[PDB]
């Protein structure tokens, strides 16, 4: 089975792991900081997802250094993962256009 | 830190009547408010979580309502077993905080 | 007609369907939750669009579990769709650069 | 001069035009709507830019139907433009990797 | 070592430089503007990162013209950098799919 | 939940005069306010929607204004047929809520 498709898959399992860990680490880092709202697992998960997809509505965000550090990792993972899929879709289109022409 | 105001402090009501304790947050906390019951010498007991969600094992008599800064814990048809102290607690922002408490008195 | 261009097209019709369904499902899931604002179709549609494009201004967002679940689907569809177009633009450029050289 | 690079360029001139028009149209559509904040050209321009790049901080956003319609166009233009550049960078890398191997 | 991978690397070192400079310039531009919040280095850095990744939660944003100008540069750098990586992942997948077939 | 305050409760005015009822929301609701009219024994009738948008079939005499927390429903030139109760209602946040009502009296 083609590499680009393996990577895409990996990227997804990975992203999910990061989202989950991201949620846990965020709450762990944010609790103890007065005024912090990223302090319960369920919403933290919703937070990381909206962060990984880079949407970030602003209803939730870390205020501590480690929380933000966890945010960066999640942002980057989401961006890389989704970009890696786009890349897989390209290799797919490129590889098949070569077919519709012969090679 | 978020301040939870519970007034009146004491509530007097006749048996079977409907009753409501209020809890006001110093700032908007969505529905991240929870209610606890504590009878004379017992430990707190979760009545309502997240402002309106019910807990299992709690008389259908107890309901919650509110959002933002104003929350209400109602008891439709009060009865002797309801004589206790009622507290509210928020989990919207760290640290979790508690209300001053309201004593139900029949 | 080339695959990459069919996919792009599909992706668009699809995204639109998801936006519409997303709008409906969001209101359906959010109504009943005190303080929720994602409760009328028109703005919900504006919400899903700004979510699909990943912009998310924060003026509107779901607060219930199903609403957020609907949000994730919309985010992912928007991201995949737009990424699939980028991929189509690449297959197009790649296929034609091969021409400007012979093959 | 290679197509992918022409497109990229076009995409940029275009995006700029859309940003400018977007700014104008937004103010035009938003004024007259009580409570609207997207009502002066300078910030509107800042608004469209942050919308085209899909960042959208939430400090400014349209509240009227035409304003949001203008927002969608700007979002899509920004997304397509930037995606078209990515696509150009790919055709460039792909075309040159073929060189580092012979063809 | 292949171009696409060199570019990706460069893009990253570059992005980092821009984030750092972006943080400095932002505080420099924002201080002096009543009500501005983008006025201390640490959070400014958190600001630029969330801007470069295009997440932008809205907890922090420039309000002055130079601050916004600095924001645009950061947005564009983040977008270009991450897009350049996606492009590198494509050249990688495309180049290797040609292998899994012979050439 | 959002509270809509309508004061004064009763409004006295001379025929032909201009009149205005106020509606205050406990929090900013944009323009998601709507106005209803209800005469003695009738059902409510939509007058103005979204704070200022007019409905068809409603005398051009009725206008609305406001945004955020302060909304106004005006009647340029009052007349006998206007004697009723006026309510405001918001759709900004769930659940929709109603004002206490203002009685127009000529
Ligand atoms: K935001
Ligand atoms: K984004
Ligand atoms: K965003
Ligand atoms: K945002
Ligand atoms: K915001
Ligand atoms: K806000
Ligand atoms: K992207």
XYZ file of C-alpha atoms and ligand atoms in Angstrom:
631
model
C 0.000 0.000 0.000
C 1.401 3.370 -1.174
C 3.477 5.532 1.196
C 1.472 8.759 0.926
C -1.588 6.828 2.074
C 0.292 5.230 4.965
C 1.566 8.592 6.105
C -1.923 10.113 5.883
C -3.212 7.307 8.045
C -0.370 7.608 10.519
C -0.858 11.360 10.618
C -4.465 10.781 11.689
C -3.822 8.252 14.434
C -1.061 10.562 15.583
C -3.195 13.698 15.555
C -5.771 11.881 17.667
C -3.121 10.844 20.162
C -1.854 14.427 20.340
C -5.386 15.767 20.795
C -5.975 13.415 23.719
C -2.584 14.009 25.329
C -2.979 17.703 24.539
C -6.251 17.763 26.410
C -4.714 16.048 29.450
C -1.549 18.135 29.526
C -3.495 21.371 29.082
C -5.683 20.804 32.159
C -2.632 19.707 34.080
C -0.737 22.866 33.161
C -3.639 25.334 33.454
C -5.034 24.273 36.864
C -3.302 26.298 39.525
C -3.417 29.497 37.439
C -6.082 31.917 38.756
C -8.688 32.786 36.148
C -7.751 29.911 33.859
C -10.683 28.260 32.062
C -8.919 25.402 30.288
C -9.374 23.247 33.404
C -11.694 20.295 32.741
C -11.017 17.408 30.359
C -14.136 17.518 28.186
C -13.817 21.145 27.147
C -10.037 20.835 26.962
C -10.565 18.149 24.329
C -12.904 20.515 22.457
C -10.212 23.130 22.852
C -7.405 21.045 21.406
C -9.562 19.939 18.465
C -10.478 23.512 17.594
C -6.804 24.355 18.005
C -5.522 21.486 15.876
C -7.887 22.511 13.108
C -6.592 26.014 13.722
C -10.135 27.341 14.127
C -9.703 28.605 17.715
C -12.939 30.451 18.585
C -11.494 32.114 21.668
C -14.015 30.603 24.067
C -11.117 28.642 25.504
C -7.333 29.134 25.481
C -4.357 28.477 27.792
C -2.939 31.264 29.896
C 0.100 29.481 31.383
C 3.466 28.903 29.691
C 3.152 25.104 29.640
C -0.436 25.324 28.470
C 0.623 27.499 25.560
C 3.541 25.180 24.892
C 1.030 22.342 24.719
C -1.054 24.532 22.408
C 1.812 25.056 19.964
C 2.427 21.318 19.702
C -1.241 20.706 19.052
C -1.397 23.532 16.449
C 1.649 22.189 14.639
C 0.435 18.589 14.728
C -2.964 19.562 13.368
C -1.386 21.700 10.662
C 1.156 19.080 9.675
C -1.382 16.257 9.702
C -3.924 18.027 7.537
C -1.178 19.264 5.256
C 0.159 15.767 4.957
C -3.266 14.627 3.747
C -3.381 17.387 1.136
C 0.032 16.167 0.035
C -1.319 12.642 -0.221
C -4.258 13.842 -2.317
C -1.766 15.524 -4.631
C 0.422 12.449 -5.085
C -2.788 10.598 -5.869
C -3.987 13.113 -8.471
C -0.495 13.538 -9.957
C 0.066 9.780 -10.168
C -3.249 9.178 -11.904
C -3.007 12.095 -14.345
C 0.139 10.387 -15.607
C -2.114 7.392 -16.295
C -4.830 9.286 -18.168
C -1.907 10.056 -20.537
C -0.153 6.680 -20.671
C 2.884 6.319 -18.361
C -11.499 34.568 42.074
C -15.179 34.004 41.387
C -17.532 34.898 44.180
C -20.703 32.947 44.710
C -23.358 34.859 46.666
C -26.122 32.874 48.333
C -28.937 35.003 49.693
C -31.147 34.717 51.596
C -29.005 32.877 54.132
C -32.026 31.193 55.682
C -35.222 30.125 53.953
C -38.468 29.434 55.823
C -41.215 27.500 54.107
C -44.338 25.424 54.853
C -44.367 21.660 54.176
C -45.202 20.628 50.616
C -44.597 24.153 49.321
C -42.165 24.943 46.472
C -38.839 26.561 47.391
C -35.853 28.151 45.624
C -32.330 29.143 46.754
C -30.391 31.573 44.600
C -26.693 31.609 43.772
C -25.092 34.576 42.050
C -21.638 34.436 40.454
C -19.508 37.587 40.436
C -19.010 36.893 36.718
C -20.473 34.821 33.892
C -19.713 31.137 34.457
C -21.949 29.543 31.807
C -23.569 26.561 33.470
C -20.492 25.477 35.412
C -22.356 25.636 38.698
C -23.125 22.587 40.904
C -25.309 22.083 43.957
C -24.530 20.277 47.195
C -26.655 19.268 50.147
C -25.340 18.838 53.677
C -27.548 17.757 56.561
C -26.595 18.200 60.226
C -23.290 16.324 60.700
C -23.147 14.699 57.277
C -20.790 15.392 54.396
C -21.863 17.237 51.268
C -23.989 15.319 48.739
C -24.138 16.281 45.043
C -27.719 17.293 44.100
C -27.427 18.930 40.687
C -24.390 19.250 38.436
C -23.766 21.736 35.660
C -26.658 23.920 36.797
C -29.437 21.625 35.583
C -28.207 18.056 35.022
C -29.633 15.626 37.566
C -27.637 13.039 39.490
C -28.930 9.501 40.003
C -30.279 8.727 43.443
C -31.526 12.257 43.969
C -35.288 12.708 44.491
C -36.887 13.910 41.251
C -38.057 16.665 43.609
C -34.773 18.598 43.046
C -34.189 20.683 39.933
C -31.681 23.281 38.854
C -31.758 26.216 36.434
C -29.810 29.262 35.326
C -26.864 30.296 33.209
C -24.241 33.022 33.309
C -24.418 34.633 36.733
C -27.820 33.696 38.120
C -28.535 30.128 39.215
C -31.474 28.566 41.030
C -31.860 25.253 42.883
C -35.534 24.413 43.366
C -37.284 21.787 45.468
C -40.843 21.148 44.310
C -42.729 20.164 47.489
C -40.378 20.500 50.450
C -40.322 17.939 53.221
C -38.569 17.304 56.507
C -35.755 15.290 54.930
C -34.856 18.451 52.997
C -33.854 20.360 56.108
C -30.153 21.007 55.540
C -27.629 23.515 54.221
C -27.329 24.035 50.496
C -24.181 25.199 48.753
C -23.308 26.087 45.185
C -19.880 25.550 43.610
C -18.381 26.696 40.305
C -15.840 25.011 38.043
C -15.768 27.651 35.328
C -12.487 29.210 36.400
C -9.700 28.138 38.724
C -9.869 27.838 41.650
C -13.212 26.149 42.267
C -15.112 28.231 44.806
C -18.070 27.733 47.129
C -21.099 29.752 48.112
C -21.684 30.893 51.674
C -24.589 28.462 52.061
C -28.373 28.715 52.553
C -30.141 26.900 55.418
C -33.562 25.459 54.562
C -35.943 25.694 57.445
C -39.468 24.293 57.574
C -12.554 15.186 -17.616
C -9.548 14.773 -15.272
C -9.998 13.231 -11.805
C -8.439 16.022 -9.735
C -10.966 18.414 -11.251
C -13.866 16.053 -10.571
C -12.809 15.654 -6.973
C -12.458 19.426 -6.544
C -15.966 19.836 -7.860
C -17.344 17.064 -5.691
C -15.537 18.514 -2.698
C -17.388 21.790 -3.269
C -20.883 20.384 -3.664
C -20.116 18.277 -0.622
C -18.829 21.157 1.484
C -22.009 23.069 0.689
C -24.144 20.130 1.752
C -22.173 19.840 4.992
C -22.487 23.575 5.644
C -26.261 23.395 5.253
C -26.667 20.210 7.286
C -24.137 21.594 9.756
C -26.254 24.680 10.211
C -29.402 22.612 10.811
C -27.789 20.105 13.155
C -26.069 22.848 15.146
C -29.320 24.671 15.974
C -30.938 21.356 16.746
C -28.165 20.399 19.157
C -27.636 23.829 20.752
C -31.279 24.743 21.519
C -32.106 23.485 24.971
C -28.709 24.527 26.375
C -29.012 27.671 28.547
C -26.863 30.529 27.295
C -26.309 28.975 23.880
C -26.221 31.449 20.978
C -25.933 29.079 18.024
C -29.738 28.813 17.925
C -31.166 30.306 14.720
C -30.587 29.003 11.193
C -29.293 32.136 9.471
C -26.461 32.827 11.887
C -25.783 29.110 12.267
C -25.108 29.033 8.530
C -22.734 31.992 8.949
C -21.193 30.065 11.804
C -20.581 26.878 9.859
C -19.115 28.800 6.912
C -16.676 30.658 9.139
C -15.903 27.320 10.761
C -15.415 25.427 7.507
C -13.007 28.100 6.338
C -11.435 27.743 9.763
C -11.717 31.488 10.374
C -13.950 31.241 13.474
C -14.289 34.805 14.822
C -15.709 33.710 18.160
C -18.955 35.636 17.783
C -20.655 32.263 17.558
C -19.687 28.746 18.677
C -21.410 25.601 20.007
C -21.429 24.869 23.705
C -23.050 21.406 23.679
C -21.337 18.085 22.924
C -23.354 17.395 19.763
C -22.920 20.963 18.595
C -19.166 20.644 18.942
C -19.302 17.253 17.261
C -21.111 18.938 14.384
C -18.418 21.624 14.466
C -15.592 19.109 14.087
C -17.231 17.548 11.039
C -17.682 20.953 9.471
C -14.061 21.962 10.278
C -12.712 18.755 8.779
C -14.904 18.977 5.682
C -13.881 22.570 5.053
C -10.221 21.731 5.583
C -10.319 18.639 3.409
C -12.291 20.344 0.651
C -10.024 23.355 0.386
C -6.979 21.135 0.650
C -8.331 18.943 -2.084
C -8.550 22.001 -4.342
C -4.949 22.953 -3.584
C -4.057 19.392 -4.520
C -5.948 19.782 -7.774
C -4.111 23.024 -8.539
C -0.850 21.167 -7.982
C -1.695 18.272 -10.296
C -2.604 20.916 -12.851
C 0.662 22.849 -12.496
C 2.756 19.660 -12.302
C 1.053 18.145 -15.348
C 1.573 21.260 -17.442
C 5.181 21.901 -16.394
C 5.901 18.478 -17.865
C 4.483 19.896 -21.106
C 6.542 23.095 -21.142
C 9.446 20.585 -21.270
C 8.098 18.016 -23.734
C 6.543 14.890 -22.152
C 7.787 32.062 -17.563
C 6.170 28.951 -16.012
C 2.398 28.824 -15.419
C 2.434 27.959 -11.710
C 4.493 31.091 -11.109
C 2.157 33.237 -13.202
C -0.847 31.951 -11.319
C 0.848 32.583 -7.963
C 1.518 36.131 -9.044
C -1.995 36.635 -10.346
C -3.386 35.139 -7.160
C -1.522 37.808 -5.188
C -2.572 40.825 -7.222
C -6.068 39.397 -7.086
C -6.064 38.817 -3.338
C -4.975 42.419 -2.851
C -7.796 43.659 -5.050
C -10.279 41.537 -3.101
C -8.909 42.790 0.220
C -9.367 46.398 -0.875
C -12.807 45.863 -2.399
C -13.667 43.676 0.584
C -12.804 46.505 2.921
C -14.965 48.970 0.972
C -17.938 46.652 0.560
C -17.832 45.624 4.219
C -18.151 49.198 5.522
C -20.834 49.854 2.958
C -22.834 46.822 4.061
C -22.254 47.139 7.824
C -23.072 50.856 8.282
C -26.752 51.168 9.023
C -26.749 48.104 11.305
C -26.950 49.123 14.994
C -24.014 47.856 17.026
C -21.897 47.068 13.979
C -18.168 47.763 14.384
C -16.912 46.997 10.882
C -17.663 50.600 9.874
C -14.476 52.512 9.022
C -12.130 51.771 6.121
C -8.813 51.422 7.948
C -9.939 48.765 10.399
C -12.089 47.119 7.736
C -8.905 46.617 5.728
C -7.261 45.085 8.813
C -10.366 42.966 9.140
C -10.320 41.628 5.601
C -6.594 40.852 5.802
C -7.019 38.887 9.015
C -9.984 37.194 7.367
C -8.192 36.374 4.124
C -5.374 34.806 6.102
C -8.119 33.043 8.021
C -6.704 34.269 11.333
C -9.814 36.218 12.424
C -9.116 37.418 15.988
C -12.723 38.349 16.683
C -11.986 42.000 17.401
C -13.887 42.764 14.220
C -16.493 40.859 12.186
C -19.568 41.636 10.049
C -23.027 41.296 11.509
C -25.126 41.952 8.380
C -25.937 39.464 5.608
C -24.044 41.370 2.902
C -21.115 41.940 5.222
C -20.888 38.221 5.885
C -21.304 37.539 2.183
C -18.358 39.854 1.595
C -16.519 37.959 4.334
C -17.016 34.592 2.639
C -15.607 35.900 -0.635
C -12.593 37.298 1.159
C -12.072 34.036 3.125
C -12.272 31.962 -0.040
C -9.983 34.273 -2.006
C -7.381 34.256 0.747
C -7.597 30.484 1.073
C -7.440 29.866 -2.654
C -4.611 32.338 -3.191
C -2.391 30.955 -0.464
C -3.226 27.425 -1.521
C -2.358 28.277 -5.075
C 1.088 29.391 -3.901
C 1.616 26.136 -2.012
C 0.680 24.385 -5.238
C 3.241 26.456 -7.097
C 5.920 25.569 -4.545
C 5.072 21.914 -5.105
C 5.314 22.074 -8.895
C 8.663 23.758 -8.354
C 9.982 21.100 -5.961
C 8.521 18.237 -8.024
C 9.941 19.619 -11.273
C 13.416 20.029 -9.818
C 13.540 16.671 -8.017
C 13.089 15.146 -11.463
C 16.268 17.031 -12.393
C 18.359 15.886 -9.427
C 17.671 12.434 -10.964
C 18.117 13.171 -14.672
C 14.873 13.780 -16.622
C 20.341 16.876 0.053
C 17.119 17.549 -1.914
C 15.873 21.125 -2.418
C 12.345 20.696 -1.049
C 13.871 19.506 2.216
C 16.315 22.415 2.335
C 13.527 24.889 1.759
C 11.383 23.269 4.463
C 14.272 23.602 6.861
C 14.979 27.179 5.863
C 11.292 27.985 6.155
C 11.401 26.798 9.770
C 14.489 28.693 10.875
C 12.987 31.683 9.119
C 9.570 31.358 10.733
C 11.262 31.230 14.127
C 13.228 34.373 13.361
C 10.040 36.123 12.247
C 8.193 34.982 15.371
C 10.920 36.418 17.590
C 11.277 39.663 15.644
C 7.491 39.784 15.367
C 7.199 39.588 19.120
C 9.722 42.406 19.611
C 8.302 44.683 16.932
C 4.742 44.147 18.155
C 5.486 45.332 21.707
C 7.472 48.205 20.291
C 4.594 49.289 18.066
C 1.743 48.644 20.526
C 3.172 50.387 23.627
C 2.052 53.982 23.577
C -1.457 53.073 22.369
C -4.019 53.368 25.204
C -5.838 50.114 25.879
C -3.339 48.004 23.959
C -2.630 44.573 25.468
C 0.102 43.319 23.146
C 2.701 45.034 25.353
C 4.996 42.501 27.043
C 7.440 40.175 25.287
C 6.344 36.804 26.663
C 2.705 37.083 25.659
C 3.656 38.844 22.432
C 5.639 35.733 21.527
C 2.569 33.608 22.322
C 0.615 36.031 20.189
C 2.856 35.795 17.149
C 2.959 31.991 17.355
C -0.821 31.741 17.470
C -0.885 34.230 14.611
C 1.701 32.433 12.493
C -0.254 29.217 12.871
C -3.276 31.314 11.980
C -5.122 30.122 15.086
C -5.566 33.582 16.665
C -7.766 33.063 19.752
C -8.509 36.753 20.191
C -7.046 36.968 23.685
C -4.349 39.143 22.166
C -4.138 41.248 18.990
C -2.516 44.512 17.834
C -4.536 47.691 17.700
C -1.976 50.027 16.085
C -1.134 50.282 12.375
C 2.462 49.079 12.779
C 1.370 46.300 15.097
C -1.099 45.076 12.503
C 1.539 45.465 9.814
C 3.783 43.259 11.930
C 0.845 40.866 12.277
C 0.388 40.539 8.516
C 4.052 39.671 8.028
C 3.848 37.051 10.739
C 0.592 35.605 9.295
C 2.089 35.396 5.821
C 5.356 33.885 7.040
C 3.536 31.248 9.062
C 1.238 30.453 6.152
C 4.035 30.307 3.611
C 6.298 28.252 5.860
C 3.710 25.626 6.687
C 2.575 25.554 3.084
C 6.132 25.100 1.966
C 6.372 22.018 4.188
C 3.184 20.570 2.708
C 4.769 21.159 -0.682
C 7.871 19.316 0.455
C 5.772 16.387 1.677
C 4.156 16.271 -1.754
C 7.431 16.251 -3.684
C 8.479 13.440 -1.373
C 5.332 11.364 -1.936
C 5.270 12.114 -5.680
C 8.953 11.254 -6.093
C 8.594 7.946 -4.279
C 5.353 6.865 -5.969
C 7.327 7.055 -9.204
C 9.671 4.527 -7.581
C 6.987 2.077 -6.454
C 6.318 1.905 -10.231
C 9.866 1.835 -11.610
C 11.215 5.209 -12.830
C -31.356 33.439 31.484
C -31.753 36.870 29.932
C -34.028 39.246 31.751
C -36.074 41.767 29.853
C -37.174 44.741 31.972
C -40.107 46.809 30.757
C -40.626 50.020 32.688
C -42.759 51.990 33.087
C -45.444 49.329 33.424
C -48.168 51.729 32.339
C -47.877 54.609 29.895
C -50.385 57.472 29.746
C -50.480 59.690 26.697
C -52.762 62.123 24.826
C -54.189 61.194 21.402
C -51.930 61.889 18.427
C -48.887 62.289 20.674
C -45.663 60.279 20.201
C -44.967 57.456 22.665
C -42.120 55.074 23.547
C -41.893 51.887 25.660
C -38.471 50.751 26.804
C -37.091 47.234 27.089
C -33.806 46.546 28.841
C -31.926 43.252 28.511
C -29.863 42.025 31.462
C -27.051 41.530 28.930
C -26.064 42.524 25.401
C -28.337 40.801 22.884
C -27.384 42.658 19.689
C -30.631 43.363 17.889
C -32.254 40.025 18.688
C -35.238 41.716 20.282
C -38.815 41.558 18.894
C -42.013 43.394 19.759
C -45.511 42.024 20.250
C -48.881 43.675 20.663
C -51.798 42.136 22.532
C -55.164 43.851 22.833
C -57.799 42.883 25.413
C -58.579 39.185 24.801
C -56.568 38.775 21.612
C -53.382 36.814 21.028
C -50.009 38.472 20.574
C -49.308 40.133 17.206
C -45.759 40.695 15.899
C -45.095 44.455 15.500
C -41.346 44.756 14.983
C -38.756 42.014 14.579
C -35.028 42.189 15.168
C -35.347 45.498 17.004
C -36.055 47.630 13.935
C -37.246 45.534 10.977
C -40.898 46.158 10.150
C -43.496 43.468 9.515
C -46.022 43.764 6.689
C -49.531 44.707 7.713
C -48.334 46.811 10.617
C -49.215 50.532 10.543
C -46.183 52.535 9.404
C -46.901 54.279 12.715
C -44.817 51.645 14.601
C -41.028 51.768 14.670
C -38.306 50.080 16.656
C -34.765 51.033 17.670
C -31.884 50.004 19.894
C -29.046 47.530 20.124
C -27.215 45.711 22.892
C -29.240 46.150 26.063
C -31.505 49.122 25.417
C -34.425 48.826 23.002
C -37.290 51.168 22.178
C -40.644 50.588 20.455
C -42.157 53.888 19.333
C -45.604 54.792 18.038
C -45.627 58.107 16.189
C -49.128 59.524 16.794
C -50.981 57.213 19.167
C -54.621 56.363 18.648
C -57.364 54.359 20.301
C -56.604 51.190 18.341
C -53.170 51.238 19.997
C -54.564 50.632 23.464
C -53.077 47.260 24.388
C -50.202 45.544 26.171
C -46.780 45.559 24.580
C -44.147 42.908 25.163
C -40.559 42.459 24.067
C -38.909 39.085 23.422
C -35.289 38.089 22.802
C -33.837 35.300 20.676
C -30.178 36.045 21.315
C -29.649 33.242 23.807
C -31.636 30.170 24.773
C -34.253 30.123 26.123
C -36.264 32.875 24.453
C -37.621 35.138 27.179
C -40.351 37.754 27.494
C -40.654 41.160 29.085
C -43.116 41.862 31.873
C -45.247 44.007 29.560
C -46.211 47.699 29.304
C -49.868 48.798 29.086
C -50.540 51.758 26.783
C -53.243 53.985 28.113
C -54.731 57.009 26.369
K -11.382 34.359 17.905
K -7.135 29.264 10.486
K -8.562 30.975 12.978
K -9.931 32.618 15.371
K -13.263 36.617 21.192
K -14.561 38.174 23.460
K -4.064 25.578 5.120
